[PDB]
Amino acid sequence: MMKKIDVKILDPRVGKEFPLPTYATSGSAGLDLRACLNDAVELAPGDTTLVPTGLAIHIADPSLAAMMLPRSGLGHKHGIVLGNLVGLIDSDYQGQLMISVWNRGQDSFTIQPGERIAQMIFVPVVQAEFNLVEDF
Amino acid sequence: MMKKIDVKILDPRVGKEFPLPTYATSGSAGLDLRACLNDAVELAPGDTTLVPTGLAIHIADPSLAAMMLPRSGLGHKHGIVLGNLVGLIDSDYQGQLMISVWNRGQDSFTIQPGERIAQMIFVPVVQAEFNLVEDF
Amino acid sequence: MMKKIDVKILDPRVGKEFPLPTYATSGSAGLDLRACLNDAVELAPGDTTLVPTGLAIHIADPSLAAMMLPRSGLGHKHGIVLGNLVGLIDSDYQGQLMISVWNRGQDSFTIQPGERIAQMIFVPVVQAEFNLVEDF
Ligand SMILES: O=c1ccn([C@H]2C[C@H](O)[C@@H](COP(=O)(O)OP(=O)(O)O)O2)c(=O)[nH]1
Ligand SMILES: O=c1ccn([C@H]2C[C@H](O)[C@@H](COP(=O)(O)OP(=O)(O)O)O2)c(=O)[nH]1
Ligand SMILES: O=c1ccn([C@H]2C[C@H](O)[C@@H](COP(=O)(O)OP(=O)(O)O)O2)c(=O)[nH]1
């Protein structure tokens, strides 16, 4: 299913020094995001850091949200995951996408400028209207 | 999209001492949940604890589930996340919502009564009917 | 909502030594997955391991993805979660489902052959078509 999402580029390097995110295959559910850094960031085990993506999106439709997940190989093989585990991006959020990266493993790891470090999917969300009942 | 969800309050303090969860903005995808505690809980790095919310919901529609996620600022900035990473609440679950809180960081942190510590979103789920094939 | 998903069994023990995954209740959103191991795997605190499921699925519909989540009791009570926190399975992925299991807790834990260690849900995903704008 395709839905149009507005995106604004916040850093000159995006699209130039490294590309805008794209779905690898037609059956891909997540987009990879890349670290828009100036210099490489070394993470010792336990450290977390905030990495800019140089992008800002505006989903604008209230039935849709985006989730940021770890990448499997990096999570499982290298211990490089998200400090907030899963990031949730609301339809009305329009600031920069920032990635909390946490080193949950036992070896230092250096994030390279432009490396793909997390992935994003867009899911339908429903807003609950609570019906108070004293018992179900 | 709005769907009606039944909710039963399990503790007298909910709605009184602190409010029932609400969507901050019209374009919010998650509801914040608050710790329905009697006393503050100090978490040393590594500790996990189970926090009641004083609420029980009953989604009751089998095409819908709820997920409990960490809050970004607390996850990323303070290392306060969920012990089971992401909690999944089924449509037929009707017991109390309980939040596993884990201190994945390096400083002790005290959870205050009524503090917002996790967030919940409602997503559509599909139930798979498996078609056995010997090869795709 | 029911959607048909093709599944191919990769190990003789699946369906025989332990069953194919099923929804416990009609209102269940996730399927439990079981470790298709030969011998029990002991995990010391900090360790991660990759566990086969002996299964391969092919969602094949591009509006649908599957997520692998920790099980609550094991995550919260025993510190046994996923090394990549949340696993995302694309509609065109057709290789074995493998589970990164991480021991985030403080006690060694042994995974038994056939034990249920993670759960899977199928969610609708949307593929974003980015509309470049200089400002929102
Ligand atoms: O990994 C993340 C998570 C969230 N956000 C943005 C989008 C979201 O709308 C806003 C607030 O996030 P939250 O999960 O509501 O947490 P908090 O209220 O603790 O800031 O920050 C990010 O850029 N990256
Ligand atoms: O953070 C959580 C996760 C789950 N639950 C409830 C809802 C769910 O229906 C029930 C069982 O959870 P599960 O993920 O199926 O795990 P387990 O079978 O290991 O108890 O517990 C919570 O209250 N909080
Ligand atoms: O827990 C997991 C996560 C993913 N996969 C499969 C499905 C997915 O299509 C493929 C690639 O996963 P990914 O999240 O894209 O990460 P990476 O590109 O780092 O391999 O591996 C698994 O078997 N188990």
Side-chain angles (χ1 to χ4, degrees):
Chain A
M1 199 212 123
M2 288 272 158
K3 218 271 155 192
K4 195 88 78 72
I5 296 290
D6 286 349
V7 65
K8 167 171 57 156
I9 287 159
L10 291 169
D11 184 288
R13 293 186 288 206
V14 180
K16 177 58 172 64
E17 221 147 284
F18 38 90
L20 298 157
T22 201
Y23 289 102
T25 61
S26 47
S28 293
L31 284 171
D32 295 311
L33 292 164
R34 306 182 175 245
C36 174
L37 294 171
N38 304 329
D39 299 281
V41 184
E42 196 178 326
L43 289 193
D47 284 0
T48 87
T49 200
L50 201 53
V51 169
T53 59
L55 289 174
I57 60 164
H58 177 214
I59 288 166
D61 171 9
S63 308
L64 201 60
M67 304 205 214
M68 271 168 37
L69 303 176
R71 280 179 74 219
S72 297
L74 204 40
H76 168 62
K77 309 211 52 185
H78 294 277
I80 301 303
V81 296
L82 296 194
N84 55 331
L85 317 184
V86 175
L88 169 68
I89 313 297
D90 310 292
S91 69
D92 54 8
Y93 173 73
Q94 299 163 39
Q96 195 176 172
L97 295 169
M98 310 299 281
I99 307 180
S100 183
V101 184
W102 165 33
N103 188 330
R104 64 149 196 83
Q106 293 155 306
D107 298 289
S108 302
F109 179 96
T110 299
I111 301 177
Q112 301 297 152
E115 184 166 14
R116 290 167 297 159
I117 56 180
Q119 61 178 323
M120 184 166 83
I121 70 185
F122 294 77
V123 296
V125 286
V126 169
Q127 289 176 124
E129 170 198 4
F130 286 136
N131 180 71
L132 184 66
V133 291
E134 295 76 38
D135 288 276
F136 312 127
Chain B
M1 199 212 123
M2 288 272 158
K3 218 271 155 192
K4 195 88 78 72
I5 296 290
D6 286 349
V7 65
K8 167 171 57 156
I9 287 159
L10 291 169
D11 184 288
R13 293 186 288 206
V14 180
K16 177 58 172 64
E17 221 147 284
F18 38 90
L20 298 157
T22 201
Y23 289 102
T25 61
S26 47
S28 293
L31 284 171
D32 295 311
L33 292 164
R34 306 182 175 245
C36 174
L37 294 171
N38 304 329
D39 299 281
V41 184
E42 196 178 326
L43 289 193
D47 284 0
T48 87
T49 200
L50 201 53
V51 169
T53 59
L55 289 174
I57 60 164
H58 177 214
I59 288 166
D61 171 9
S63 308
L64 201 60
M67 304 205 214
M68 271 168 37
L69 303 176
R71 280 179 74 219
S72 297
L74 204 40
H76 168 62
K77 309 211 52 185
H78 294 277
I80 301 303
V81 296
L82 296 194
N84 55 331
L85 317 184
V86 175
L88 169 68
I89 313 297
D90 310 292
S91 69
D92 54 8
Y93 173 73
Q94 299 163 39
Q96 195 176 172
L97 295 169
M98 310 299 281
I99 307 180
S100 183
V101 184
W102 165 33
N103 188 330
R104 64 149 196 83
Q106 293 155 306
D107 298 289
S108 302
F109 179 96
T110 299
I111 301 177
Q112 301 297 152
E115 184 166 14
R116 290 167 297 159
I117 56 180
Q119 61 178 323
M120 184 166 83
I121 70 185
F122 294 77
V123 296
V125 286
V126 169
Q127 289 176 124
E129 170 198 4
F130 286 136
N131 180 71
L132 184 66
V133 291
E134 295 76 38
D135 288 276
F136 312 127
Chain C
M1 199 212 123
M2 288 272 158
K3 218 271 155 192
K4 195 88 78 72
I5 296 290
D6 286 349
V7 65
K8 167 171 57 156
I9 287 159
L10 291 169
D11 184 288
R13 293 186 288 206
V14 180
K16 177 58 172 64
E17 221 147 284
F18 38 90
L20 298 157
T22 201
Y23 289 102
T25 61
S26 47
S28 293
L31 284 171
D32 295 311
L33 292 164
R34 306 182 175 245
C36 174
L37 294 171
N38 304 329
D39 299 281
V41 184
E42 196 178 326
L43 289 193
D47 284 0
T48 87
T49 200
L50 201 53
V51 169
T53 59
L55 289 174
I57 60 164
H58 177 214
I59 288 166
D61 171 9
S63 308
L64 201 60
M67 304 205 214
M68 271 168 37
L69 303 176
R71 280 179 74 219
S72 297
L74 204 40
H76 168 62
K77 309 211 52 185
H78 294 277
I80 301 303
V81 296
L82 296 194
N84 55 331
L85 317 184
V86 175
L88 169 68
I89 313 297
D90 310 292
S91 69
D92 54 8
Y93 173 73
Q94 299 163 39
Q96 195 176 172
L97 295 169
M98 310 299 281
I99 307 180
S100 183
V101 184
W102 165 33
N103 188 330
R104 64 149 196 83
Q106 293 155 306
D107 298 289
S108 302
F109 179 96
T110 299
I111 301 177
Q112 301 297 152
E115 184 166 14
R116 290 167 297 159
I117 56 180
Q119 61 178 323
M120 184 166 83
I121 70 185
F122 294 77
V123 296
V125 286
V126 169
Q127 289 176 124
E129 170 198 4
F130 286 136
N131 180 71
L132 184 66
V133 291
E134 295 76 38
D135 288 276
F136 312 127

